[PDB]
């Protein structure tokens, strides 16, 4: 009876995760993309403010992406609805809860800023040369803070990204050992798809866009992570949201 | 071209101020009241959570009532649009800014809670006896924090309310002296209607509902404040929003 009403930016990292949770929970929702198509100068989304999506479910109006996702989990508990979180006392809950926080803490806003401002560190980046040169000209005429110390701050957080991926690479390795090679493979934290998988999937996809995917995984580096990303790419909910 | 889209609860104090700002700025907006009419037990709004309205203006999605109001002021600057804030260097800006904060700091949530839980301190309260007895029964079976120390905390903040109204009473007195008795009277902070007047108007109206209006003003107590409330009641924008 009640309608779900999401207001989001199509190319917003926080918003993307929310959409996927909806897709994973198989909920009918009236998504309202507010992002403008292209402007006079086709001002893309990778060029700061602090804007966040908002969900409206009847009397409840939830802002912030993490709050909306948690709301969805608690609100919709129909028997058909799939839960992206395990039981509080489940052996999986510590893992889902630990790795979900580990991935959400990554400063994606900073990674984006660095990708444009310093393409020297990127590999097969989907952000073009015109973007880099364009914003450098904007700087010359004049978020600067997210650049922070220039190339020195950027390399620092990119190495921290490797450390986080190292944890995830290890976790996936554990899954492959426990699971027989033939048979249904499990996700990051157990066989069922969880909120931790959502954060991981979206994070990896965004990294691919920034060109940091090649240097982190692939070519036999972090083989389990590479396999994971390929598996999640084929997933139907993933393809629908992140098409 | 772009549509304003407000999502609000009809009987939400924070939301009410936003609506009035829209009405004062004479902006066409698509207000979406999310409040449910009446439920099975007609659960009224004075019976906690922390929910806040959300504005959607094209790409911008602003939450929190104070942020939305500020956004409206900066966003819509058409020559026809009336500004509820003076120039930053205007003599009125310190006053509008001081008294706007003084009124927004009042814990209306607490005052509401006290009105129901302790009608002994109220006078001609619009909350009925069934409400008081109803929630006391709910307590017996079991925001408790906003009750805090029971009647001792409640009296404390009600006296602090008198102190704030004392400041406002003094400010209005100043206006009457400066203005000739015959001629257009000015509002709290100057002749033009400001955001300070919005906060003051809504605050007074809500107090009336809680029954704390009689003991604070009226019967010759705070005569300028009484006159103010009568004047703002007749105002068209006020009648439309707080009808």
Residue numbers in the entry:
A (entry chain A), B (entry chain A): 23 to 69, 73 to 167, 194 to 294
Question: Please, what does the article write about this entry?
Answer:
Charcot–Marie–Tooth disease (CMT) is the most common inherited peripheral polyneuropathy in humans, and its different subtypes are linked to mutations in dozens of different genes. Mutations in ganglioside‐induced differentiation‐associated protein 1 (GDAP1) cause two types of CMT, demyelinating CMT4A and axonal CMT2K. The GDAP1‐linked CMT genotypes are mainly missense point mutations. Structural analysis of GDAP1 indicates that CMT may arise from disruption of specific intra‐ and intermolecular interaction networks, leading to alterations in GDAP1 structure and stability, and, eventually, insufficient motor and sensory neuron function.
Using GDAP1 variant crystal structures, we identify a side‐chain interaction network between helices ⍺3, ⍺6, and ⍺7, which is affected by CMT mutations, as well as a hinge in the long helix ⍺6, which is linked to structural flexibility.
